[PDB]
Design a protein around this ligand. Structure first.
Ligand SMILES: *[C@@H]1O[C@H](CO)[C@@H](O[C@@H]2O[C@H](CO)[C@@H](O)[C@H](O)[C@H]2NC(C)=O)[C@H](O)[C@H]1NC(C)=O
Ligand SMILES: *[C@@H]1O[C@H](CO)[C@@H](O[C@@H]2O[C@H](CO)[C@@H](O)[C@H](O)[C@H]2NC(C)=O)[C@H](O)[C@H]1NC(C)=O
Ligand SMILES: *[C@@H]1O[C@H](CO)[C@@H](O[C@@H]2O[C@H](CO)[C@@H](O)[C@H](O)[C@H]2NC(C)=O)[C@H](O)[C@H]1NC(C)=O
Ligand SMILES: *[C@@H]1O[C@H](CO)[C@@H](O[C@@H]2O[C@H](CO)[C@@H](O)[C@H](O)[C@H]2NC(C)=O)[C@H](O)[C@H]1NC(C)=O
Ligand SMILES: *[C@@H]1O[C@H](CO)[C@@H](O)[C@H](O)[C@H]1NC(C)=O
Ligand SMILES: *[C@@H]1O[C@H](CO)[C@@H](O)[C@H](O)[C@H]1NC(C)=O
Lengths: 446, 120, 119, 441
């Protein structure tokens, strides 16, 4: 049998400074219990007496038997001084109801409502329901209300009366995901260098969880952190991952990971540690190139070099070539390890057929690739003779090796023909792909 | 365990103290002997009281765009302490009001933040 | 005349006001009828008083190295007012009253404005 | 002269006691009283105040028809208030300065000056007291600037401090103002809005600065910006501006700065021109002569205002690419002068002709032309058989007959066992063709 109370009312009213007196009749009576806001008192007299009521005595009074069953009365203290009772703390989960702890000490008052500080009208879509026993409650708290400033207001004698001033604060719901970005995307290092990568996480709240883990390995790395709050609902974190002396085994994938109750985001960086630096070299043309005298040729190498190449030079016949050669990284990316070099030989002479060498070095390695240039020439005839046998010779020179024909009516090859003719004109006519030259001689009888 | 929830803006506090009059007065319900009684007996009360106190200061200042201002710094400190309140309520009667010059009040604040980083 | 003494560090005042507590009180020996009278009679006494008040106010703050600070701004203003005191003295006490920073800086700005076509 | 009772120079009266003074002189005009900046005058030869306040410490003077005068000086001993103060303290650098904390009680010992917040006074600051006046500070330096001072008295072993005195110092000028100008020299098209800035740095805002058009006392309309940057450190920026600079506005401008010590001036010169202009100088004769396969460099050096919008080199009315190069002759902000180069390597001998340089701005276009000849040791085109030898040259071939770019022909009648040689030559060299005849059988 849940316990029974004298006086008999659900709500009861006393003037300030005037006695309060409650009796609970149960043979199983245990306890009397009084609540308002966070204040709670527990008492085991059969009757509760307070000969000097105060506004703070406003609250709820609840009586319990050993059956474990309870009956309550709610008690209100008229006090012209303090019409409200407050706890300033006011926090809201975004999209949850939030309660504004301003319960009234008199229930017999009108237009219990909520009003902005400094005259400002509350946001149009804010809407609320009042309860004199609890406070006023705000439906579906949304981010605009953050540090919204509130008063609770009540009318007495036609005069309009306000509580001490309240600030709502709002604790985000997550409705999107963390945003995560990494300072450099791929890394290459000499063994023994220090490795430092920084990862940046942005979210509406610092309850984002973020980590650095190494893929296909579950162990937590060691990390240093920096955080900023960049005004309302704007939080940024930076996380730094360091290996102070990088081993080759360190090579692999590092993942920067960041989950919130909406869901995870990840971004990875890849690391190569190498024991010593390299220079690979890739010629872009064949290593043997052919040019006609006074035409133009380019020699082009592309090469991969780490650490960054320190000298790069072009030499001809053991003399260092200058101001004919231009070199550029293939891509401007931070991860490019790659370079292109060119030598432009313009209006080449037959005399500079020969060998052209490219030499490049970084701190660990020196590498060279060599080119051979054959400058084609139109043939010439350079000797002609008429000889005691009745027999004839001519000598022709050039590259590719020329050809010599007879008619009647590194560097230059050398080629010769003989024929005996024993009235008119004998010719040597001399040709290769490049050009043709011809020489003539005559002999007579009388 | 919430040592991550303090954002490093707190270093700004020394600039804030430098920009407050040495004889301005700030009002805080000082939980007794937190300088005395151990790190976890006061901290739950103190962090909520500091929240109220710092929002009071935040009312006193006004915002300016260009540069750092007392309003910027206090705004960010209220974000810190209100997230610490959210934490202490998840992870885990009023002292009488008391008046502090900025140096003393911020020493209390920095003692609370230091008390946080080694918490059960 | 004395227009050259006031330097454009006065523009800093609006930031100083914004950066001081609205409930703070500053103490100035006012020169009543200040608003109604012509400039010349009150301005002479006012710059002297403003020097005193700004100097005491200057003590309350401490110096910051990285970026602008109230001690810096007030130090510059104190220089201006002491220069204007000197030119007023060399070219040409009521009881204290307590002002919020906005009020006190209105009074200051009006005093510095009294040196635009001053006689 | 007059006489005053009580007889002595000095009187001491307890607070709330009567001060009574009579001057006995039949030409008496007035008592007169003054302490700090207070003043009172009375034409009553008998002067009383029945309850002397602490403030009624001061000096009281009697004055008459003669103009003769006698004074009495009066203390009001109040254990509650031992100084009168005036909080406003100013010093001029290396003048003695007085700190107005005169005593209300003279029977005190160790009257002295002492630094606020327990800081000690600087080692070479020193002072002379007077109970009637205050304490006077010798030979103020600049390091005493914004020093804070208290006045310190011992009275019955009891020790008393004034309100804060803060000591602030008018610098005395000991070096010349320091003056700097954004640019030493300007050139502008007429129409341009000339503007220059002059910067003056000194210890105090009472430095004086002006902009003067050279050779005139006329005044130039100018606008100012100034900062204090720390103590005893002032900076001013003063900016001259003309909206449309004219040719007769072209001329010389001075920025002048002055203080009680001395004067400094800095000057800028303004050229204004009516037409934009370009002038060209070749570094080399316009005719150039080249051996075939020698290297050539062509250089044009030119002064061009406003800055040139094109540079191109053209050869026989076809546009020339990737062998021409430009740089200003100086990097500096004054620079109007530019160099252009074209480089030709191992010229072919077909490749003589005219090479021209064209440069333009918004107002002028200018052209300079170079004529380039490419010599060759003559190349014998054709040998044919009367037999002819035809030779292709620059300069003109010279042709020889032996028996044992232009084109020029020689031929000879062939009419014993033989070789006949043709030699074609000029200043570049020799090219030879052999045609050979034997009579046999
Ligand atoms: C976000 O990341 C954390 C850590 O990885 C997750 O919390 C872990 O969840 C597993 C079970 O799923 C537990 O066994 C671990 O003990 C938890 N670790 C920590 C440090 O709490 C969390 O579940 C992830 N998901 C979300 C929505 O936060
Ligand atoms: C890391 O991020 C990637 C996406 O950026 C995730 O890859 C997706 O995962 C889902 C579920 O497995 C697949 O349906 C998608 O096809 C995947 N997209 C791509 C591009 O791979 C990945 O699951 C995340 N991994 C971790 C450990 O966080
Ligand atoms: C600065 O040079 C001026 C002149 O510009 C000095 O003397 C002044 O000369 C003008 C006439 O050119 C007079 O009208 C001024 O009144 C003169 N000054 C005085 C006090 O008579 C001037 O004094 C120099 N500045 C300083 C500080 O000495
Ligand atoms: C501007 O400054 C220059 C010095 O910087 C002054 O030149 C001097 O003028 C006097 C004659 O008046 C000469 O005897 C000195 O030899 C000059 N000194 C130098 C270094 O040239 C000049 O007089 C100043 N002019 C003005 C109007 O101030
Ligand atoms: C890297 O090499 C060392 C041995 O020098 C070893 O102790 C360590 O476990 C290795 N790390 C990995 C990930 O293999
Ligand atoms: C310059 O030229 C204009 C027009 O001739 C004239 O009005 C002006 O007075 C001249 N100014 C000077 C300094 O000569």
């Amino acid at each position: 049998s849940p316990p029974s109370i004298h006086p008999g009312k659900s709500d009861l009213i006393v003037r300030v400074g005037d006695e309060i007196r409650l009796l609970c009749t149960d043979p199983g009576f245990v306890k009397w219990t009084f609540e308002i806001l966070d204040e709670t008192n527990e008492n085991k007299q059969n009757e509760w007496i307070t000969e000097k009521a105060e506004a703070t005595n406003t609250g709820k009074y609840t009586c319990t038997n050993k059956h474990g069953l309870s009956n309550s009365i709610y008690v209100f203290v008229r006090d012209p001084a303090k019409l409200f009772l407050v706890d300033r703390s006011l926090y809201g989960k975004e999209d949850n109801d939030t309660l504004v702890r301003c319960p009234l000490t008199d229930p017999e008052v009108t237009n219990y409502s909520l009003k902005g500080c400094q005259g400002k009208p509350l946001p149009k879509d804010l809407r609320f329901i009042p309860d004199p026993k609890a406070g006023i409650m705000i439906k579906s708290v949304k981010r605009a209300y953050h540090r919204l400033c509130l008063h609770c207001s009540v009318d007495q004698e036609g005069k309009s009366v306000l509580s001490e001033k309240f600030i709502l604060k709002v604790r985000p719901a997550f409705k999107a995901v963390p945003v995560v970005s990494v300072s450099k995307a791929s890394y290459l290092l000499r063994e023994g260098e220090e490795f430092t990568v920084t990862c940046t996480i942005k979210d509406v709240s610092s309850s984002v969880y973020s980590t650095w883990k190494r893929e296909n390995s579950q162990t937590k790395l060691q990390e240093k952190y920096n955080s900023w709050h960049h005004g309302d609902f704007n939080y940024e974190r930076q996380a730094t991952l360091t290996i102070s002396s990088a081993r080759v085994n360190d090579s692999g994938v590092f993942m920067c990971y960041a989950n919130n109750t909406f869901g995870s985001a990840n971004v990875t960086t890849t690391l190569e540690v190498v024991d010593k630096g390299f220079i690979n070299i890739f010629p872009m043309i064949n290593t043997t190139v052919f040019v006609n005298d006074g035409e133009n040729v380019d020699l082009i190498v592309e090469y991969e070099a780490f650490p960054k190449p320190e000298h790069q030079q072009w030499i001809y016949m053991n003399r260092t070539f200058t101001d004919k050669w231009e070199d550029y990284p293939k891509s401007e990316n931070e991860s490019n390890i790659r370079y292109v070099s060119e030598l432009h030989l313009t209006r080449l002479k037959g005399t500079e057929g020969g060998t052209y060498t490219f030499l490049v070095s970084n701190s660990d390695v020196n590498a060279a690739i060599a080119f051979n240039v054959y400058v084609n020439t139109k043939p010439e005839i350079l000797t002609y003779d008429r000889l005691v046998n009745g027999m004839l010779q001519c000598v022709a020179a050039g590259f590719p090796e020329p050809t010599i024909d007879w008619y009647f009516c590194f560097g230059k090859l050398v080629v010769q023909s003989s024929i005996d003719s024993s009235n008119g004109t004998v010719e040597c006519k001399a040709y290769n792909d490049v050009g043709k030259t011809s020489a003539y001689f005559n002999f007579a009888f009388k | 365990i919430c040592r991550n929830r303090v954002t490093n803006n707190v270093k700004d506090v020394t600039k804030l103290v430098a920009n407050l009059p040495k004889d301005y007065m700030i009002t805080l319900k000082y939980v007794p002997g937190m300088d005395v009684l151990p790190s976890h007996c006061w901290i739950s009360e103190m962090v909520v009281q500091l929240s109220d106190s710092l929002t009071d200061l935040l009312d006193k200042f006004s915002n300016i765009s260009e540069g750092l201002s007392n309003y910027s710094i206090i705004d960010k400190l209220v974000n810190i302490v209100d997230d610490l309140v959210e934490c202490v309520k998840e992870n885990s009667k009023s002292p009488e009001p008391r008046l502090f010059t900025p140096e003393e009040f911020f020493r209390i604040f920095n003692r609370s933040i230091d008390a946080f980083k080694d918490f059960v």
